[PDB]
């Protein structure tokens, strides 16, 4: 599976998150952490538009940077979990 | 009434997207709940707000940025004898009862880009507001946000939103389920009774 900004939210659901309880704690908890970190990063991606100290162009730079790092985190969680067995 | 940053489906009407927090309907549902269960601790007597009382606080969260319990006290004309249930601190009546953050964020954005006036009605369809929130909560890139907008909103006012607003968190009830619940609660009914009335 490939994660995108459009695929995001549609894949970072509490239902897929629940499918990770199946794994042992030493396999579950880390993948859960990446999952959570991606959710928090995407959610606050446009927070820079609210800040005025930054320039709108410089804010759009973090946006692209945040969204990419977020889908990067989710992809690792998905891929690490699939190798551990759980399908999505 | 609760919040969560991850996406889900409505508990009542499955296969529907949990509504974003920053939507007029969800924001109203949150405000409707708090005013509907708010109670007055007078002497050794608990009391519900009466119909006219609620009316004097109904549209105020839209008009002013926040509604502190202190503002509601002056608005209601409550004697110092009466107090607010649930409220804990030195200055706690300064705590915000409701904010309606999405409404005042969209308004501030439009009036920031000079496409709206201050102290003025946020001239927007409610379903519009909703999808503005729904989109800014499900997408973060300017590309994906704009594409979902699908010119439902003027190009001038979309540049404004994509320049100053940012949304997160959902509300555990679908926008559709709310749509059948939120009129009933405007009639004074509580979530507890209204949910069973429509679905249960």
- Chain B contact set for A69 (CB, 8 A): none
Query: Which residues, in sequence order, are CB contacts of B183 under 8 Å at separation 6+?
Result: none
* Cα angle for residues A83, A84, A88 (degrees, 5° grid): 75
Probe site for chain B from A3, A4, A7, A9 (most B CB atoms < 10 A): A9
Of B6, B141, B167, the CB nearest to A63: B141
Domain boundaries along the sequence of chain A: 14-84
Please, which experimental method was used? X-ray
Tell me if chain A has a CB within 8 Å of the CB of B165. Answer: yes
Query: Which residues, in sequence order, are CB contacts of B52 under 8 Å at separation 6+?
Result: none
Instruction: Provide the sign of the torsion angle of the four alpha carbons B148, B154, B156, B158, taken in this order.
Output: negative
Tell me if chain B has a CB within 8 Å of the CB of A60. Answer: yes
Tell me if chain A has a CB within 8 Å of the CB of B166. Answer: yes
Cβ contact (<8 Å) for B140 and A5?
yes
Token look-up 């949304």 returns B167
Of B9, B141, B169, the CB nearest to A67: B141
Q: This structure's resolution (angstroms)?
A: 2.7
Phi-psi sector, B95: left (phi>0), alpha (psi -120 to 50), beta: beta
CB B73 within 8 A of CB B93: yes
CA B76 to chain centre: 21
Token digits of residue B178: 């709310």
């Amino acid at each position: 599976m490939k994660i995108t900004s459009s695929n995001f939210a549609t894949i970072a659901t509490s239902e897929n998150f629940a499918k990770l309880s199946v794994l042992p704690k030493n396999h579950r908890e880390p993948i859960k952490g990446l999952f959570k970190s991606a959710v928090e990063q995407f959610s606050s991606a446009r927070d820079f538009f609210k800040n005025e100290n930054y320039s709108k162009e410089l804010a759009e730079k973090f946006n692209k940077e945040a969204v990419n790092e977020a889908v990067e985190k989710l992809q690792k969680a998905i891929d690490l979990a699939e190798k551990q067995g759980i399908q999505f | 009434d609760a919040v969560q940053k991850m996406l889900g489906h409505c508990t009542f009407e499955p296969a529907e997207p949990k509504a974003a927090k920053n939507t007029y309907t969800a924001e109203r549902f949150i405000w409707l709940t708090k005013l509907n269960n708010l109670r007055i601790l007078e002497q050794g007597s608990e009391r519900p707000l009466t119909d006219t009382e609620r009316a004097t606080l109904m549209d105020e969260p839209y008009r002013k940025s926040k509604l502190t319990y202190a503002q509601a006290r002056k608005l209601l004309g409550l004697e110092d004898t009466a107090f607010f249930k649930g409220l804990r601190k030195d200055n706690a009546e300064a705590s915000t009862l409701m904010e309606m953050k999405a409404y005042h964020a969209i308004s501030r954005a439009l009036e920031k880009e000079g496409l709206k006036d201050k102290k003025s009605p946020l001239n927007l369809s409610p379903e519009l507001q909703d999808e503005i929130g729904t989109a800014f909560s499900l997408f973060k890139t300017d590309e994906d946000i704009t594409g979902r907008l699908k010119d439902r909103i003027q190009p001038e006012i979309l540049e404004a939103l994509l320049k100053h607003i940012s949304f997160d968190k959902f509300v555990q009830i679908s926008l559709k389920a709310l749509r059948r619940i939120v009129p009933l609660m405007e009639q004074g009914k509580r979530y507890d009774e209204a949910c069973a009335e429509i679905y249960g």
